[PDB]
Amino acid sequence: SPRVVRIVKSESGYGFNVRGQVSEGGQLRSINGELYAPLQHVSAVLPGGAADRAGVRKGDRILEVNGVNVEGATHKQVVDLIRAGEKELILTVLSV
């Protein structure tokens, strides 16, 4: 089920990579049997980094960034939202 994680930047940034489509919207695809528009996802987690310690895992799909729904969002929208705070990030994620 979707869950919320709070992450504070360390020396190393947040310690994850985000990957997904450049465009908006597109073909529906279910995640764990729940229907969604395309979702950006976590493509890497730095061992021992902030995201790792918050329990973010490779493959986690990103549903919200800083309380903003990012279902179907562009990669730029998600990157810019991740950058909204000076040091804190809140994500709603879905593990696969």
Binding site: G13, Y14, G15, F16, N17, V18, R19, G20, Q21, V22, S23, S43, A44, A51, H75, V79, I82
Partner: peptide, 7 residues
Amino acid sequence: EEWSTVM
């Protein structure tokens, strides 16, 4: 077309 960004 997908992009990856280091955060």
